[PDB]
Amino acid sequence: DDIKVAVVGAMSGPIAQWGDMEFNGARQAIKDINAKGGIKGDKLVGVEYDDACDPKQAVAVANKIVNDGIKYVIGHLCSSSTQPASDIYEDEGILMISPGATNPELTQRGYQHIMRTAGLDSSQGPTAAKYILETVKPQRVLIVDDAAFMRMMLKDIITKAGYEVAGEATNGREAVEKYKELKPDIVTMDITMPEMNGIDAIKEIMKIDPNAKIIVCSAMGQQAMVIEAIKAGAKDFIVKPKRYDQDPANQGIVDALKADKKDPSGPYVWITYAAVQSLATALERTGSDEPLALVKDLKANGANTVIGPLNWDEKGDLKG
C-alpha cells in the first residue's frame, strides 16, 4: 500500500547547497501529507538519490529508479541531469516532475510523463549563483546590483567555487564604467529597480563590446522588461520568485523547518514542496496509479501548492 516516490538532486558537488533545499522541502511535504492521512490512508515513502547534478550519475540514478520499480520521480535538480534522465523515465512510463530543470528542450519533445514546477516563462531558475555554477565556467564576474547584501551573497558563493569577482557596480552608469575598466568575462545585473536603468546599461555595454555576456535578474511581473533585455543582447535571465517563506499560510512549514535547524528561505524548498503536493493531489483526485492519468489530471485541473495555484499546459510547462 506504500507509495514510493523517488527524490533526485545534488546531495554532493557544487550544487549541493541547493540540493539541500530540495530534499528539505520534499521531506517536509511527505511528512505533512502523511500526517494528514497520506493518500486516502496510503503512506508516501520518499526514496532519495544523489546525482551530484552530473549527467552520467543522473543516468545511473534513473536506471536505479527503473530497477526499483518506482513510478513517481520528483527531480532532477539541474537541467543537464534531468534531460538524459527524462528519456529513461519517459521510456519506462515513469512520472517525473522536476523542481529545477529550466532548459527549454525538456518539454518540447512530446513526452507525456514529464512535468516541472520551475522555469516559468523561460526563467533559468530562481537564483543566479546556481545558474552560474551549473552553466558557465570559472571566469571574471562583474556583479551589478544596488543591494549590497545581494552582492556579498553572490560573491561568496562563486568565489568559493573558483570564480573571480572583477568588480561591483551599484547602478547602470557605474556598470558601464566598470565594464570599460575591467572588461569582465561575464556580467550579472539585477534590473529590478528603475534606478538601475538596466536596459539602457545593456545597450551601452553592447556598444562597447558586441560579444558581452550579460545575465540579468528580475522580479515577478517584469516579463516585458526581460524580453527587452534579451533583445538588447543579454544572454539569459533569472526571475527572483516571491518569498514563499513569508507567506503567512506557510508559517507552519517555516516553523517545522526551523525546529529542524533548516533554512526555510531557499526557493527550492518550496518549489520541491509544491512538486510533492502536485503528485499527492493527482493521486488523491484520480485514485489511479497510472502516471499518464496523473499527468493528464494535473494538466486538466491543476493543484494548490505552497507556491500558489499551479497549472500546466499539454507539454508539461507551467502556465499563468
Curated annotation (Swiss-Prot):
Tell where it localizes. Periplasm
Give the family this protein belongs to, as stated in its UniProt record: Belongs to the leucine-binding protein family.
Function of the protein:
This protein is a component of the leucine-specific transport system, which is one of the two periplasmic binding protein-dependent transport systems of the high-affinity transport of the branched-chain amino acids in E.coli.
Q: What is this protein called?
A: Leucine-specific-binding protein
- Which keywords does this Swiss-Prot/TrEMBL entry list? Amino-acid transport, Disulfide bond, Periplasm, Signal, Transport
Q: Does the keyword Magnesium apply?
A: no
Q: Name one GO cellular component term.
A: outer membrane-bounded periplasmic space
NCBIfam families named among the record's database cross-references: PRK15404.1 (NF011933)
Question: Disulfide bonds, which pairs?
Answer: 53-78
Q: What Pfam families does the database record attribute to this sequence? A: Peripla_BP_6 (PF13458)
Q: Which SUPFAM superfamilies match?
A: Periplasmic binding protein-like I (SSF53822)
Tell me the GO molecular function terms: L-leucine binding
What domain of life is recorded for the organism?
A: Bacteria
InterPro entries from the xrefs? Leu-bd, Leu_Ile_Val-bd, Peripla_BP_I
GO BP terms, alphabetized: branched-chain amino acid transport; isoleucine transport; L-leucine transport; phenylalanine transport; valine transport
